[PDB]
Amino acid sequence: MQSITAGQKVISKHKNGAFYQCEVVRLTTETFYEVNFDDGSFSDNLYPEDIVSQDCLQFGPPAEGEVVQVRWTDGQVYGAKFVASHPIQMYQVEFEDGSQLVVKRDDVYTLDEELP
Structure with a gap:
């Protein structure tokens, strides 16, 4: 839904697994790449x-379809x-302890929204 911008305080999960307020x-x-391995x-x-x-x-x-090797x-x-x-x-977020994560839009919540 609604756009999240840099400098906004949001709520997201810290690496310990709990939600805290963090800052974008x-x-x-x-950029992610998608490949079919040779086993399919x-x-x-x-x-x-x-x-x-x-x-x-x-x-x-x-190129699309090109043979590659992957680590x-x-x-x-x-x-x-x-x-x-x-x-x-x-979204690169930072918590009060200084830790950072890079997360997807669905993992970020605004201050007004209910969390599961």
Whole structure:
């Protein structure tokens, strides 16, 4: 719904798992890449740096369908095919203790709204 802007106090979950008031420090776009691995499983939220067959931070995404190699969550490298680049607007928030998270719009609540 309603837009959240930088400098707004909002309520979001801290890394400890509870909601606290925090402040939006900045709005950022995070670019996620989506790939089909060679076993046919699909990932929708690789980061550009996880493509280890090409330097996508420098040269941008692979071509759609291009064969790539990916460094995965288990630290190993696997073969894949590039599907798409998916930029998402996100919100960098900071809590009173100084910790920060980058979170999605649905994870941020305004002061007036009920929390689950």
